Structure formats: structure tokens, C-alpha cells
Ligand binder design. Structure first.
Ligand code: MG
Ligand code: MG
Lengths: 133, 134
């Protein structure tokens, strides 16, 4: 998967609107190998952790949790939320081959992270499908 | 190797009562307390639920994931994640710390609302942390 030109612009605007609606810090669209396709940071937030590193670790986790999903009777998980004391991550599918990642702190309410995250994942899935066909 | 903690006698009965209560309040299928090596310390299944998947394998895989996501937690400034939800189309899993060395796991389907799973799951995990610490 590779986005450039118009579809890239469109994915970046989705990530921008998603950050405004959720109050999350960083939003990324990544492939399942961990390659960053697009990313946006909230102006107010500090410098993120290295985002390629974050993406590789999220893609490792997505491959690894499939065995557990299969034990529950499904090919893979659709979404996962990992909460620390102060930081959390929401990961959702953007179609078959990509993942939306949102990194948030206590100032994003989780309900919004998940609601606008789902919506963003669907918009990104259309972008990704249209760019792949 | 032995478990990080083993329960017996009254702590055990009390951990089992937490698990049964949590199943009733949440509508979840299976409720387990496990350690970070994958041993099942206590488990309870809802009377209506079918036979679970192999619960020793479920605890092992949850424990493997709990080790593996520490690098990602560290990257975000945390020693490890404190709670995780893995959501499938129909099934889900809620994992929460029960003190330093044990994890509460709840396995649910769409008949358990997620807001109940999390609220009663967090209460269970705190009651189990106490049982564990002592
Ligand atoms: Mg999804
Ligand atoms: Mg907790």
C-alpha cells in the first residue's frame, strides 16, 4: 500500500479531523507491516515518540494477537485498546491491509476516541481501497 | 517453575466469589485470574455459556501478549499497560492487573455490554489485587 497525491491529502485530512474531534495526541495510518502511510500530530502535544518505531511495534502486536483471536473463534481482532496510567492507544482496521492508530492521554475521553476512531477507520478504508484498485 | 502466587483456603474461595459475581454483573462468559507465566490461579464459567476454549492456552496467550506489549508501553512512557480490550466481531477480551503478578481476564460476547465489563472488571481486579497481595 502506498498513498501519494490526492488520496494522501485526503487521508491526512481525515487524521486532522480525527485529532480535533477526539482530543487525541497523534494519529497514524500504517500498513500491517508497520510502514507509516500518513501521520498527524496535535499542535498542542509534545514531540511524539519515533513514529516508525511506534508503528513497527503496533504491527508486531497486530500479528501476535491473531492466535488469541483464533482461540476465541475469529481470524483476528477488529479493534484493541491499550491503556497505561497516563497514555493509551486505540488501533482499528482501515480495510484489509492498514491500521488506524490513535495515541491519547487523559484529556481525550475514551468514548470519543473510539467513536471518531471508528468513523475515521471507515473513511480511511475507502481511501485505501480506492487507491489500491 | 511454580506459579507466581498460588491461592488456597479462604483467599481462594474469596477470589472465586469475585469471579462469579463479576460474571453475573457483566454478562461475560468466562472469568479467570492468571499469572504472568500463564498459570490459571482461579477460573469460573457462566452457567449458560458453552464449554470454553482450552483455558490453559487462553491464559498462556494472554500472558505472552502481556510480556510482548511492554516494549510498546515503554515507548509511550509506561512500564506496562494496565488494561487492555481486544475486540472481535462477536467475542472480546478484557485484561486488567490484579496487583503486580496476576491478571484478571474476562471473555465476553455481544450479550455483555462493554461498559459493564469494564466497570465490574475494574472492581474485580481491585478485589483480586487485595486477595493476591496477601
Ligand atoms: Mg474496525
Ligand atoms: Mg487496573
Amino acid at each position: 500500500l502506498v498513498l501519494y497525491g490526492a488520496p494522501y491529502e485526503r487521508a491526512v485530512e481525515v487524521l486532522e479531523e480525527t485529532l480535533r474531534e477526539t482530543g487525541a495526541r497523534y494519529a497514524l495510518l500504517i500498513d500491517r507491516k508497520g510502514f507509516v502511510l500518513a501521520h498527524k500530530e496535535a499542535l498542542w502535544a509534545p514531540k511524539p515518540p519515533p513514529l516508525d518505531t511506534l508503528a513497527t511495534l503496533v504491527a508486531s502486536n497486530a500479528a501476535a494477537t491473531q492466535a488469541l483471536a483464533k482461540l476465541l473463534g475469529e481470524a483476528r481482532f477488529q479493534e484493541e485498546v491499550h491503556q497505561g496510567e497516563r497514555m493509551g492507544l486505540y488501533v482499528d482496521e482501515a480495510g484489509e491491509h492498514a491500521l488506524l492508530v490513535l495515541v491519547f492521554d487523559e484529556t481525550a475521553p475514551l468514548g470519543k476516541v473510539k467513536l471518531h476512531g471508528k468513523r475515521a477507520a471507515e473513511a480511511l478504508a475507502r481511501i485505501a481501497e480506492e487507491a489500491l484498485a
